[PDB]
mmCIF file of N, CA and C and ligand atoms in Angstrom:
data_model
loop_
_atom_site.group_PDB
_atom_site.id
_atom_site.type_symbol
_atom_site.label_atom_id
_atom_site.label_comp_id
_atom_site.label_asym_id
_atom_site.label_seq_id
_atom_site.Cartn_x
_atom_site.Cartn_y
_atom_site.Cartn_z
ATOM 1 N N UNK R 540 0.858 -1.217 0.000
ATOM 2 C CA UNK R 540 0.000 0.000 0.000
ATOM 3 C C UNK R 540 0.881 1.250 0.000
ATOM 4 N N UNK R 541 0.646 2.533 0.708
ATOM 5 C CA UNK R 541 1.498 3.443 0.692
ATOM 6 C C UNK R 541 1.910 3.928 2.096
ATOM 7 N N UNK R 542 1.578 3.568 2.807
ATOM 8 C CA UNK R 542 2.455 3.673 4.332
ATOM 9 C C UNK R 542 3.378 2.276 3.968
ATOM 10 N N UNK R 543 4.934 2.769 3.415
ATOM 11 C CA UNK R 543 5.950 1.630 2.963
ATOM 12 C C UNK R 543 7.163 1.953 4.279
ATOM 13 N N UNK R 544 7.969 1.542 3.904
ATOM 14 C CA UNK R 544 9.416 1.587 4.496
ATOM 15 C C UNK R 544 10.592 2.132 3.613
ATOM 16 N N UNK R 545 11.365 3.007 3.725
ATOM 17 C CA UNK R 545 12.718 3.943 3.126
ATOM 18 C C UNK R 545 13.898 3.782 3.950
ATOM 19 N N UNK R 546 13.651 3.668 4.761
ATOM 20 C CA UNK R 546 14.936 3.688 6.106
ATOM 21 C C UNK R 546 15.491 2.806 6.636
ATOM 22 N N UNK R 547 14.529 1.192 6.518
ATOM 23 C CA UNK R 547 14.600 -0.149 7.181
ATOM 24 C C UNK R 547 15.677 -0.499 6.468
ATOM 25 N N UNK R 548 16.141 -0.123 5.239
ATOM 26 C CA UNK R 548 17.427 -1.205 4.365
ATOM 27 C C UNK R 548 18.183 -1.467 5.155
ATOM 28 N N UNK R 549 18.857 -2.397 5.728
ATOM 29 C CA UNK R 549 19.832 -2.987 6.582
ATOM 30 C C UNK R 549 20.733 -4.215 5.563
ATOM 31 N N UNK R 550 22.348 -4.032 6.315
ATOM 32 C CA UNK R 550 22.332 -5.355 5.463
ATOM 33 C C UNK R 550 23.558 -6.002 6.556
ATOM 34 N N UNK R 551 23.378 -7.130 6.807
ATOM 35 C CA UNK R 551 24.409 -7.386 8.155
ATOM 36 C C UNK R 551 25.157 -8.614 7.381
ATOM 37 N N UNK R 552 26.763 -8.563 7.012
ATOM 38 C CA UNK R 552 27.624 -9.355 6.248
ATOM 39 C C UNK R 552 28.606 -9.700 7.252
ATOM 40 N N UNK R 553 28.651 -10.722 7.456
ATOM 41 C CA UNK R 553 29.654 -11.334 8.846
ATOM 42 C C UNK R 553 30.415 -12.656 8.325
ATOM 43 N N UNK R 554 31.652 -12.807 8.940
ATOM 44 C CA UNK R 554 32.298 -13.841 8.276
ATOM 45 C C UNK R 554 34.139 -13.823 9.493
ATOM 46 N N UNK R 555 34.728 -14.589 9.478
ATOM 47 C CA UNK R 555 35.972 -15.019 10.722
ATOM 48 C C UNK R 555 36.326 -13.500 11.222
ATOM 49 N N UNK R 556 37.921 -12.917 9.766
ATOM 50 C CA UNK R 556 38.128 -11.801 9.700
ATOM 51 C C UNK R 556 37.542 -10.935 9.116
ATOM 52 N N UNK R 557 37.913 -9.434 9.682
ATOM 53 C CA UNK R 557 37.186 -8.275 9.070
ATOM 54 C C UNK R 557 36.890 -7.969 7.482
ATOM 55 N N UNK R 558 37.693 -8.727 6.727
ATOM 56 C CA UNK R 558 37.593 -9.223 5.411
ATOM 57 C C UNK R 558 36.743 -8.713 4.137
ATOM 58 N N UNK R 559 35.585 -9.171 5.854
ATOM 59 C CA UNK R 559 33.963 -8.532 4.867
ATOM 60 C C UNK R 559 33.678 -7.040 5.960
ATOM 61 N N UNK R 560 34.283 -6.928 6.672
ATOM 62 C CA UNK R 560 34.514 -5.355 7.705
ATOM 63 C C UNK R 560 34.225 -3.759 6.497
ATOM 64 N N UNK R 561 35.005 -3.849 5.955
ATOM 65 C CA UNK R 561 35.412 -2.605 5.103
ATOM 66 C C UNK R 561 34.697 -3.283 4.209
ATOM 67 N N UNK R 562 34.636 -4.227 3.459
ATOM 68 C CA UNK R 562 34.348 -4.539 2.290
ATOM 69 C C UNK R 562 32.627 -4.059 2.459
ATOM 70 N N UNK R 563 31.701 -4.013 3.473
ATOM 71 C CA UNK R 563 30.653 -3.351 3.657
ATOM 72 C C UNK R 563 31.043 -1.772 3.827
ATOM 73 N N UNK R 564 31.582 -1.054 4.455
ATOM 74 C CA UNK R 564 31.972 0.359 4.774
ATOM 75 C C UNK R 564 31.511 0.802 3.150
ATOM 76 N N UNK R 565 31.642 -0.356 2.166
ATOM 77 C CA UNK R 565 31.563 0.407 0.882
ATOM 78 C C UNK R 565 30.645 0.054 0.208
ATOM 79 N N UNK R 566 29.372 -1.209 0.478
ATOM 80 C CA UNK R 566 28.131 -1.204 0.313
ATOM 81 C C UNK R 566 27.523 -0.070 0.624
ATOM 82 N N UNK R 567 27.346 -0.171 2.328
ATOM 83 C CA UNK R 567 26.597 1.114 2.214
ATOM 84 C C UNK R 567 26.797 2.529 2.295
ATOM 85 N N UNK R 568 27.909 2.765 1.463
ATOM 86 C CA UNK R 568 28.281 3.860 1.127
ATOM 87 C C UNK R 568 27.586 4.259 -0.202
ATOM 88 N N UNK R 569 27.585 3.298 -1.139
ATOM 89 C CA UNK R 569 25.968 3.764 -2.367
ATOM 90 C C UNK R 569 24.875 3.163 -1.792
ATOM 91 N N UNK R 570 24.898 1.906 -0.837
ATOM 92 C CA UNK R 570 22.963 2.148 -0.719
ATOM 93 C C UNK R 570 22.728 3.483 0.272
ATOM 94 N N UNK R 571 23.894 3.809 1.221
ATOM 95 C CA UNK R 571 23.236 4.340 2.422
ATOM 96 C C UNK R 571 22.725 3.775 3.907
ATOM 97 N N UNK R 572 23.142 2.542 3.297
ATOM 98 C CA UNK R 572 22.289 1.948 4.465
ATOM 99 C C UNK R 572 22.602 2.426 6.313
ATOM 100 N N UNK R 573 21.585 1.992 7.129
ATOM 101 C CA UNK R 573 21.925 2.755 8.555
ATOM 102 C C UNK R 573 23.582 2.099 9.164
ATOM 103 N N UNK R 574 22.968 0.536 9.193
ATOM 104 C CA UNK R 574 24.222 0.266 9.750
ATOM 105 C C UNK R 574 24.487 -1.379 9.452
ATOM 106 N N UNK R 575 25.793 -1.733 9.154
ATOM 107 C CA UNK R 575 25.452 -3.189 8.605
ATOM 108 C C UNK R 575 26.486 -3.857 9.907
ATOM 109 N N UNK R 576 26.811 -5.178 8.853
ATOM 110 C CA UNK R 576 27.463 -6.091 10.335
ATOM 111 C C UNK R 576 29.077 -6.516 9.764
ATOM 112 N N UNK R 577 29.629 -6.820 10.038
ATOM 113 C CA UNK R 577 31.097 -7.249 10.131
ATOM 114 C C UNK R 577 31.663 -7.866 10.970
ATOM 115 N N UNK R 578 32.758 -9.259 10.312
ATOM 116 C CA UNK R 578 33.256 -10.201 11.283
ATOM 117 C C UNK R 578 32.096 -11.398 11.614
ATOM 118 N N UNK R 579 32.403 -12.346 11.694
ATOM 119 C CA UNK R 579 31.255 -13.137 11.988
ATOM 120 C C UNK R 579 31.112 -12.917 13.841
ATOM 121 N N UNK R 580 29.795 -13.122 13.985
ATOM 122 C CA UNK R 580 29.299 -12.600 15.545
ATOM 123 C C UNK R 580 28.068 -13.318 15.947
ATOM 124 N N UNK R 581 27.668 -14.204 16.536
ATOM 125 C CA UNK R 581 26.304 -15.047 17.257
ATOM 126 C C UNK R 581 25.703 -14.157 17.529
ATOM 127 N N UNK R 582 26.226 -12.857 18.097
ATOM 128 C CA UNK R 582 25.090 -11.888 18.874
ATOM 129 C C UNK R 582 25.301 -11.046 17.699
ATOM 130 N N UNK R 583 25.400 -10.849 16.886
ATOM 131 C CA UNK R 583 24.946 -9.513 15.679
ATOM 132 C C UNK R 583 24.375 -10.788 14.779
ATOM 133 N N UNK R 584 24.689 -11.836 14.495
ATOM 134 C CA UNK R 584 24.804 -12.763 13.420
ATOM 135 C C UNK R 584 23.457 -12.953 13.671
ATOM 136 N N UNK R 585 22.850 -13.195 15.322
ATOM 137 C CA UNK R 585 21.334 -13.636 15.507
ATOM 138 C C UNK R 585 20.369 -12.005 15.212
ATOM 139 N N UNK R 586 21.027 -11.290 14.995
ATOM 140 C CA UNK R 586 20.035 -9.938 14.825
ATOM 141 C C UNK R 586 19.624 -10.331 12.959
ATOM 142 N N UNK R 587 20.559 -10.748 12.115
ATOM 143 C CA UNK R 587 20.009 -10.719 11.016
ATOM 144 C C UNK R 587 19.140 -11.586 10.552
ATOM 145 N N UNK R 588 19.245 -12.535 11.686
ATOM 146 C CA UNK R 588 18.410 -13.616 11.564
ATOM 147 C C UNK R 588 16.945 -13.623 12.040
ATOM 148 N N UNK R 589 17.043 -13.328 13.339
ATOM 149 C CA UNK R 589 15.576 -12.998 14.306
ATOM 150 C C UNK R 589 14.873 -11.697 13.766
ATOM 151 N N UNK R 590 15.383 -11.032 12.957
ATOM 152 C CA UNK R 590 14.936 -9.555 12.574
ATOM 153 C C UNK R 590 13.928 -10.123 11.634
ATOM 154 N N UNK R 591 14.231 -10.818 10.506
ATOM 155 C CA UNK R 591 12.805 -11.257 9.407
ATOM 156 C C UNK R 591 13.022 -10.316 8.409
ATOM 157 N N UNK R 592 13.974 -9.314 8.860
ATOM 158 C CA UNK R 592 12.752 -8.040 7.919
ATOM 159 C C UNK R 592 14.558 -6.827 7.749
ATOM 160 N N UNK R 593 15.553 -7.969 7.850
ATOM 161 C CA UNK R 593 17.157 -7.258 7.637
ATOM 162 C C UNK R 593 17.088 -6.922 6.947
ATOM 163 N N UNK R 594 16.734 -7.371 5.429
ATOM 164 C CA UNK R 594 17.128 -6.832 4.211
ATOM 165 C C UNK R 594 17.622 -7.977 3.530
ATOM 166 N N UNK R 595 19.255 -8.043 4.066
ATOM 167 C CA UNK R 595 20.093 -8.886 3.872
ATOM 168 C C UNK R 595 20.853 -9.607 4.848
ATOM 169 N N UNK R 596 21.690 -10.556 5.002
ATOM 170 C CA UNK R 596 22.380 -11.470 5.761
ATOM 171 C C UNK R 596 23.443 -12.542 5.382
ATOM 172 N N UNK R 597 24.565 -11.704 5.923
ATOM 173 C CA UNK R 597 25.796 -13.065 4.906
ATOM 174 C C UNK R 597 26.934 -13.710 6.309
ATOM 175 N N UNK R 598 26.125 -14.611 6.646
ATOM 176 C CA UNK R 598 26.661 -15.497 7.261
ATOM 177 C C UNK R 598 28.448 -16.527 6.581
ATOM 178 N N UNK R 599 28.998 -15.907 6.038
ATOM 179 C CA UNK R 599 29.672 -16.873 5.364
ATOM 180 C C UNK R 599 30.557 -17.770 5.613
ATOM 181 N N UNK R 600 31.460 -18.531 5.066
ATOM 182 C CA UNK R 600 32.262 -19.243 5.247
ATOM 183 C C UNK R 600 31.817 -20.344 6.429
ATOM 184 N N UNK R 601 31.638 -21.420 6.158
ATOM 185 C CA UNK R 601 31.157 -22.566 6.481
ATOM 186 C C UNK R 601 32.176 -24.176 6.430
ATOM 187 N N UNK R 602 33.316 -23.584 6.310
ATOM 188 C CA UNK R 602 34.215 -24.636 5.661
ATOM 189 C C UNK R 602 35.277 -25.005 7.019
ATOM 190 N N UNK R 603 36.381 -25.702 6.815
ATOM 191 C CA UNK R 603 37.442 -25.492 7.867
ATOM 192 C C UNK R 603 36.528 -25.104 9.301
ATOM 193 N N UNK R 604 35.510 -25.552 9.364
ATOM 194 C CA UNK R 604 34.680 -25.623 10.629
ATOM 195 C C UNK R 604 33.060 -25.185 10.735
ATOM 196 N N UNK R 605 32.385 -24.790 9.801
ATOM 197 C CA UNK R 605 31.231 -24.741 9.440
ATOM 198 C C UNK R 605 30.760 -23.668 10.404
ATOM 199 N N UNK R 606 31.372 -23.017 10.778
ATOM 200 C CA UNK R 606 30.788 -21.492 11.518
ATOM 201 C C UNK R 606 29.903 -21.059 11.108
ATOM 202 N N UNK R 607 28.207 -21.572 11.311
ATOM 203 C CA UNK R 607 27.429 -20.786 10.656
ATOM 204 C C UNK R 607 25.972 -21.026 11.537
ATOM 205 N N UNK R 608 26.255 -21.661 12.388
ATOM 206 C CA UNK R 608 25.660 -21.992 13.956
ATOM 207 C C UNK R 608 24.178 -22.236 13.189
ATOM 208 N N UNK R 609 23.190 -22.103 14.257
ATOM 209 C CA UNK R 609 22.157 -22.261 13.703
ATOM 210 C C UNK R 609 21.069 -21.244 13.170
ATOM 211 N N UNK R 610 21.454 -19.976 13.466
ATOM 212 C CA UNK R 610 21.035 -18.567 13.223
ATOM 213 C C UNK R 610 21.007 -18.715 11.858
ATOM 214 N N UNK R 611 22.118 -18.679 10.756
ATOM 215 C CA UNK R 611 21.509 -18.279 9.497
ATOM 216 C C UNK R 611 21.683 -19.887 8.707
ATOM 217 N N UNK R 612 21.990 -21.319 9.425
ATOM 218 C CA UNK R 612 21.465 -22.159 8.705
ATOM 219 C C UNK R 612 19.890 -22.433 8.836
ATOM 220 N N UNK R 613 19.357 -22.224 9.858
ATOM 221 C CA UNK R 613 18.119 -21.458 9.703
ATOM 222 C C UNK R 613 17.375 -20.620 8.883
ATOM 223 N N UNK R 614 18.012 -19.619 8.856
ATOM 224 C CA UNK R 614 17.463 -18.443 8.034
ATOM 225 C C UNK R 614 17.581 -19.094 6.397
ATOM 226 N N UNK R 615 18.399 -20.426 6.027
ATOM 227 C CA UNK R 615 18.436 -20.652 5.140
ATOM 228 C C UNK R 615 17.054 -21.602 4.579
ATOM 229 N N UNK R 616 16.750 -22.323 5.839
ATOM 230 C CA UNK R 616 15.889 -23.682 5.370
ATOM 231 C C UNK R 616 14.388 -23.576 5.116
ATOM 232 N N UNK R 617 14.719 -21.580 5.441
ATOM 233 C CA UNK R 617 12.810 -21.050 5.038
ATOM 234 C C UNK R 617 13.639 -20.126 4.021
ATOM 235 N N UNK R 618 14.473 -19.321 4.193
ATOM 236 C CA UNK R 618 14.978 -18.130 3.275
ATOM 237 C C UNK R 618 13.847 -16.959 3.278
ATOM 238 N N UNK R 619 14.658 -16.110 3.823
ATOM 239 C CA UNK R 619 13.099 -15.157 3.518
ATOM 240 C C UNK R 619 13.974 -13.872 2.303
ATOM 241 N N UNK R 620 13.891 -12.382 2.840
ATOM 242 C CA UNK R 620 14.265 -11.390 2.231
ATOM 243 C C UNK R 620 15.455 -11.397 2.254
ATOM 244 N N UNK R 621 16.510 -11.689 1.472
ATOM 245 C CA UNK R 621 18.245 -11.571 2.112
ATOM 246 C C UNK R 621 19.141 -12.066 0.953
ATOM 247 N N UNK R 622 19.896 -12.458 1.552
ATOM 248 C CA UNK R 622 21.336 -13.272 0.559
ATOM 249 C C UNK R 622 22.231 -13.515 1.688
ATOM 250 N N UNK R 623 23.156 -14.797 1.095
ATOM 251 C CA UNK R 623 24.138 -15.334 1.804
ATOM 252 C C UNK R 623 25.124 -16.074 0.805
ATOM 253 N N UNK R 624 26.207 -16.204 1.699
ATOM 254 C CA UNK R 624 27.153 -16.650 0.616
ATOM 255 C C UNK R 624 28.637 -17.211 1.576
ATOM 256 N N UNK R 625 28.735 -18.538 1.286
ATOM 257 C CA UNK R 625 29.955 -19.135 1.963
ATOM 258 C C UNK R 625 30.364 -20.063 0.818
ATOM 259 N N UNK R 626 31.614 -20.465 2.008
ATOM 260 C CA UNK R 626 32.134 -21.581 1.382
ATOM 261 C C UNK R 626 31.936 -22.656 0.203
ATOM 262 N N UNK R 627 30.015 -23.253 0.675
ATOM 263 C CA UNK R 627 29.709 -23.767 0.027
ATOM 264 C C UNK R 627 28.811 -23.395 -1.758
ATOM 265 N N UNK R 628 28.559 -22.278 -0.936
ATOM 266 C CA UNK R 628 27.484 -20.937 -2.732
ATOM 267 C C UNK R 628 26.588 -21.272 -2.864
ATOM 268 N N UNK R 629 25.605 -21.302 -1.686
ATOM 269 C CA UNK R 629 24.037 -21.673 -1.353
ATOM 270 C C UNK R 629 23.668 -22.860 -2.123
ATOM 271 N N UNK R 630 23.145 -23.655 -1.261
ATOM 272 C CA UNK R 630 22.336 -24.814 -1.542
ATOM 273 C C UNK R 630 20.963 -24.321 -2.534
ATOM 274 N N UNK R 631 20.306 -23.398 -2.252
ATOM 275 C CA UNK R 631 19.398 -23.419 -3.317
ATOM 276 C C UNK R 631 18.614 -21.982 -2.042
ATOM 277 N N UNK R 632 18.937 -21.192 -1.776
ATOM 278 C CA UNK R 632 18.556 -20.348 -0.436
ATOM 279 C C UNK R 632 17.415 -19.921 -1.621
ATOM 280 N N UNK R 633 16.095 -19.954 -1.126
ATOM 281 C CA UNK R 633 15.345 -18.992 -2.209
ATOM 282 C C UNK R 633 14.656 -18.187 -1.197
ATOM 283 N N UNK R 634 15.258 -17.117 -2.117
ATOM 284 C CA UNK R 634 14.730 -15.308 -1.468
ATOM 285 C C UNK R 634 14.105 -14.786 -2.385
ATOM 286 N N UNK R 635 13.476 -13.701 -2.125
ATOM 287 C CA UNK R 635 12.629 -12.954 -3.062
ATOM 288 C C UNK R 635 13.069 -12.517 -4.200
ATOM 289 N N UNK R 636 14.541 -12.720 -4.062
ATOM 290 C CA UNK R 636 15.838 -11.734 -5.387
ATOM 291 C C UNK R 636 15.445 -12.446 -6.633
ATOM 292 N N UNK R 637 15.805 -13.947 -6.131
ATOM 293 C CA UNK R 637 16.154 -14.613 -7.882
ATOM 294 C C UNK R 637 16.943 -15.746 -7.811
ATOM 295 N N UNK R 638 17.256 -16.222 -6.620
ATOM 296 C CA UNK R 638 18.384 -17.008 -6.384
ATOM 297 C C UNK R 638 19.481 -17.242 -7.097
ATOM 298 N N UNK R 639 19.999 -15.945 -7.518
ATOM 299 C CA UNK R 639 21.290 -15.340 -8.244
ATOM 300 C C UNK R 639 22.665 -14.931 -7.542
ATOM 301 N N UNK R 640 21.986 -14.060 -7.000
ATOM 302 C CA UNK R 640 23.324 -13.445 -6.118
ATOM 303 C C UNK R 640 23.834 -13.856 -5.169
ATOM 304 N N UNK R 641 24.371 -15.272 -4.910
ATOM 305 C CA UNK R 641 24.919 -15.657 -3.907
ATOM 306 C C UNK R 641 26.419 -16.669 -4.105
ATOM 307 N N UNK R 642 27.032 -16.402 -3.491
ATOM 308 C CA UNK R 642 28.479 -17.116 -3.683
ATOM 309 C C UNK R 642 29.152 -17.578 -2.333
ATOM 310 N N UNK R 643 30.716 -17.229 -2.360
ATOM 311 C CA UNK R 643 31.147 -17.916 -1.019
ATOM 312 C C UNK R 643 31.980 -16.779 -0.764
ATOM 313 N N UNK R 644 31.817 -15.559 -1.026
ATOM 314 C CA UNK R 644 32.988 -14.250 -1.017
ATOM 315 C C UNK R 644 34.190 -14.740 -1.131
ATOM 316 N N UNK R 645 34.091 -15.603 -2.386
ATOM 317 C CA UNK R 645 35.419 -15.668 -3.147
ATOM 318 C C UNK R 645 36.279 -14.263 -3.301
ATOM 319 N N UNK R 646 35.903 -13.332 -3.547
ATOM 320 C CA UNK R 646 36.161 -11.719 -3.732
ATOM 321 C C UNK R 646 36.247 -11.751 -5.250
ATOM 322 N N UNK R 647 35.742 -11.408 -6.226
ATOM 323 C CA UNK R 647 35.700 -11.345 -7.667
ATOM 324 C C UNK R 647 34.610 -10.811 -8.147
ATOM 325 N N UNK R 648 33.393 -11.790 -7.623
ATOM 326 C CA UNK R 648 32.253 -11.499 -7.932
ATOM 327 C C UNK R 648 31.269 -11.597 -7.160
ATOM 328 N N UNK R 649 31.819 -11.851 -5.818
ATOM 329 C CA UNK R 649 30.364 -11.741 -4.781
ATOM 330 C C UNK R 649 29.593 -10.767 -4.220
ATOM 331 N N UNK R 650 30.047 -10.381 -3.484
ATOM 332 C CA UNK R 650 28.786 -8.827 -2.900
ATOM 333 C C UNK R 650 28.692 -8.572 -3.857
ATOM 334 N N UNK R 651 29.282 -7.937 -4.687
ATOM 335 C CA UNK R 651 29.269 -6.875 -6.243
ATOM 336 C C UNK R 651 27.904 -7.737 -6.670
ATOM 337 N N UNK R 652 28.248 -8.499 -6.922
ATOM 338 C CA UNK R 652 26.776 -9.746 -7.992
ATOM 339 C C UNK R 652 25.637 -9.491 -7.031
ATOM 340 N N UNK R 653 25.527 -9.454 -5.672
ATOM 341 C CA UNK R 653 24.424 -9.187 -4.528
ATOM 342 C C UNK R 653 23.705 -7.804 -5.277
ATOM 343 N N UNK R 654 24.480 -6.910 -5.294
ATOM 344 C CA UNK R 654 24.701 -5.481 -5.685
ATOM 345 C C UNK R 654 24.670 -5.483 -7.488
ATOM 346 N N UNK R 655 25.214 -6.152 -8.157
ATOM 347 C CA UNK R 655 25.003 -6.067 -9.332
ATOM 348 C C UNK R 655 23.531 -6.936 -10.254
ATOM 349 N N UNK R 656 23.194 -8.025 -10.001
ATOM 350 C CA UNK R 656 22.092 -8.736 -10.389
ATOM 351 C C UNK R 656 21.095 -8.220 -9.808
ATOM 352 N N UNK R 657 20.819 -7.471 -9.152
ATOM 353 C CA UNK R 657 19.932 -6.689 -8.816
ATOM 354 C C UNK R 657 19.519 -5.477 -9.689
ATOM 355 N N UNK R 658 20.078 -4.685 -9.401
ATOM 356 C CA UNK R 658 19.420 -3.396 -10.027
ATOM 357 C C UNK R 658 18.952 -2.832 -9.625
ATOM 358 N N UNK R 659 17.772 -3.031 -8.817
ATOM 359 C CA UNK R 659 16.732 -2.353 -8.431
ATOM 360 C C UNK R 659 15.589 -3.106 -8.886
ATOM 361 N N UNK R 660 15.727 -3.370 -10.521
ATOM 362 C CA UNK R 660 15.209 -4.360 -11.399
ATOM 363 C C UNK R 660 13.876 -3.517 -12.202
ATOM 364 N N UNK R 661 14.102 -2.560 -12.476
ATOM 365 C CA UNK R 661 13.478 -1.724 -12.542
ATOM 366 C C UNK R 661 14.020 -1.040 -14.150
ATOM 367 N N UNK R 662 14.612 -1.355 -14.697
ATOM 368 C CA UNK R 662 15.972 -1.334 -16.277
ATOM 369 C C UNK R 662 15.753 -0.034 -16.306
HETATM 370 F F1 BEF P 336 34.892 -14.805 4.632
HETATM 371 BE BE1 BEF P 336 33.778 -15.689 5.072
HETATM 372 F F2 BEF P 336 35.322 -16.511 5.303
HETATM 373 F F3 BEF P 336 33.645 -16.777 4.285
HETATM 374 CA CA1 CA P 337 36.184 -14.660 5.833
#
């Protein structure tokens, strides 16, 4: 309807090292967004999860010990509004996007593809 949301964009990207730290500082530097996440964290990691309504959520890297607790393998086995991307490059996470943009932040083409296969979608 038209009482929407402008301000809610959130996007919380967590993973061992800061890696994905800065590498957000520069997401939402073109979306804007309020405030995102960095470093992998149980207690920020469960905000993107219990929230429903993050935006986004990148739990990553799942390998060399499967750090990905049950917060966003969860968030995976319904998938709601979001993206994620580890080790493995989603099992089949279906979100509202397209089930496109997701990888293992190889660094080449991941966030960017989050950020690029998108658009807005709007051409
Ligand atoms: F960087 Be998260 F290692 F996958
Ligand atoms: Ca990492």
């Amino acid at each position: 309807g038209s009482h929407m949301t402008e301000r809610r964009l959130r996007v919380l990207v967590v993973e061992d090292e800061s890696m994905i730290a800065m590498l957000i500082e520069d997401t939402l530097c073109e979306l804007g967004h309020e405030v995102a996440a960095t470093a992998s964290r149980m207690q920020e990691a469960l905000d993107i999860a219990r929230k429903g309504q993050f935006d986004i959520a990148i739990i990553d890297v799942n390998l060399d010990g499967e750090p990905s607790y049950p917060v966003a393998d969860i968030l995976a086995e319904r998938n709601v509004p979001f993206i994620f991307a580890t080790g493995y490059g989603s099992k089949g996470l279906d979100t509202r996007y397209s089930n496109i943009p997701l990888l293992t932040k190889p660094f080449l083409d991941s966030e960017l593809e989050a950020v690029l296969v998108q658009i807005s979608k709007e051409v």
